[PDB]
Design a binder for these strands. Structure first.
Ligand SMILES: Nc1ncnc2c1ncn2[C@@H]1O[C@H](COP(=O)(O)CP(=O)(O)OP(=O)(O)O)[C@@H](O)[C@H]1O
Ligand SMILES: N=C(N)NCCCCN
Length: 402
RNA sequence: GGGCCCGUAGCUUAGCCAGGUCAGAGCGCCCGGCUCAUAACCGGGCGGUCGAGGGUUCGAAUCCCUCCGGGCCCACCA
């Protein structure tokens, strides 16, 4: 007998699968043909700005030889090897040898690595593996079996029947709101009571019927029963880093701010908020690094109404990814609020010269602002996987748009 | 005491000094859409009679007259 971590990534298509499904089909066979799969499989999300999830599951077979073969099959039948955007990869790391990968995984969640850095690893520990085509999978693969989970969450992922593949998903929508209604926060980020959307029911080719996140088996269990939906074929719970901010980089730990990575910076507003056709807002804040601009895009919705209130001077904390040199707000902290006054010519009942008063002074008044200090985030429909929703953070000044 | 600018939908604005698609647009906004993808025009829609008052003219947002509201500059007195 042997304990071994299986890891899979990049296997679906722009019309194929959900890599998580294959990992389940691989689990099914392993569970009835080689041994026993231990605990819940993990769905680890890697760097989200990559030019993205991976799966892993700890098994216990008698013979790793066969183990590989089996998981290779599923990968040679239920995997879209046709498309060119799909280059699968598989790893089998001995239980012990897991932790010794946490770094490599950390590096593939917060930065950008090339296939070599992954081969270099498989080599350092001579790790049984499966490359297909380019096998750019082997990156996520390892990463998935090395991802550290200090803070984690769960996700109940349901799948439809193969024959019901392609059809538009039916479900008594409303049953998810009765849902969110009584478990929340417990089960969360599943719906948007504001933008009126049921965010956990994808509209893709993947067999994924629904997908409910929460913080406990208890909640997920109650939830799965409490909701009306089309027949559920398979169903599995995944431990994930979903909603953990496990990709942000602290400004207190890097000199430059490269593109394709996520951070958390503090700064003063320099250039006021503004729009562009599309509802897209922008504003430049001053920082330790220098001139850094922030985007508060439209899908961000109800967030913009908060972003536009920022005035030159305000001290704020921006949470987001850096692309096009801009930091895409996932959330923002209003540290201190800068006061702003306005000048006006007095009246009897105007200006008469450069130095020749009017009275002598101009009417200076302190206009009260509305925007207020605290943590503001983007509403669920706009939620990013890794992005940690505030309902989870323990800090004050939280404004949770449910 | 004189010299100016500026005022079009809730905002920010094309048009205006070459007066005859008397109304374009972006944001917001109401309503929908999209997402396993942070996302640099996603859609429609309501909405203005062009600061007010008057004159010119077949005709004015558009040229002219003044007023209100903002707001600026140069002299001068002392
Ligand atoms: N840090 C990183 N740097 C570079 N490539 C990375 C990376 N982390 C992951 N990758 C690679 O990016 C590719 C992701 O492909 P997929 O896994 O198909 C996207 P997915 O999001 O997993 O597919 P899906 O959208 O159907 O869920 C894989 O090659 C993965 O190994
Ligand atoms: N709750 C989920 N399973 N998914 C919600 C994703 C929302 C952003 N697409």
């Amino acid at each position: 007998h042997m304990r071994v971590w299986v890891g899979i990534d990049d296997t679906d298509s722009s019309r194929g699968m959900c890599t998580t499904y294959l990992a389940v089909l691989a689990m099914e066979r392993v569970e009835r043909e080689l041994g026993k799969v231990i605990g819940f499989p993990r769905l680890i999300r890697l760097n989200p700005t990559i030019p993205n999830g991976a799966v892993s599951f700890l098994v216990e077979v008698d013979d790793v030889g066969e183990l590989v073969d089996v998981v290779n099959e599923v990968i040679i039948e239920h995997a879209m090897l046709d498309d060119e955007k799909t280059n699968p990869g598989a790893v089998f790391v001995d239980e012990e040898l897991a932790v010794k990968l946490k770094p490599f995984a950390d590096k593939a969640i917060k930065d950008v690595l090339q296939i070599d850095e992954a081969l270099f690893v498989i080599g350092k520990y001579f790790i049984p593996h499966l490359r297909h085509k380019k096998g750019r999978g082997l990156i996520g693969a390892l990463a998935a079996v090395g991802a550290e989970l200090e803070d984690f969450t769960l996700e109940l992922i349901a799948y439809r029947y193969p024959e019901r593949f392609g059809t538009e998903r039916e479900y008594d929508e409303e049953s998810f709101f009765d849902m969110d209604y009584e478990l929340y926060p417990q089960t969360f980020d599943n719906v948007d009571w504001c933008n009126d959307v049921v965010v956990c029911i994808p509209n893709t080719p993947c067999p994924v019927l629904y997908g409910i996140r929460g913080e406990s088996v208890e909640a997920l269990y109650k939830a799965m029963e409490s909701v009306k939906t089309e027949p559920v074929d398979r169903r599995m719970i995944f431990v994930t880093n979903h909603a953990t901010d496990m990709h942000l980089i602290g400004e207190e730990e890097v000199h430059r701010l490269e593109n394709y990575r996520s951070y958390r910076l503090r700064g003063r507003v320099t250039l006021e908020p503004y729009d562009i056709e599309g509802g897209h807002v922008f504003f430049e804040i001053d920082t330790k690094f220098g001139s850094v601009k922030c985007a508060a895009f439209e899908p961000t919705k109800q967030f913009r109404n908060v972003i536009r209130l920022l005035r030159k001077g305000d001290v704020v904390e921006v949470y987001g990814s850096m692309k096009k040199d801009t930091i895409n707000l996932e959330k923002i902290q209003i540290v201190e609020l800068a006061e702003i006054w306005v000048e006006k010519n007095p009246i009897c009942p105007e200006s008469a010269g450069r130095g020749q008063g009017f009275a002598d002074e101009k009417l200076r008044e302190k206009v009260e602002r509305e925007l207020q200090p605290g943590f503001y985030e983007v509403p669920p429909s706009a939620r990013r996987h890794l992005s940690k929703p505030l309902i989870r953070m323990n800090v004050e000044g939280r404004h949770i748009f449910r």
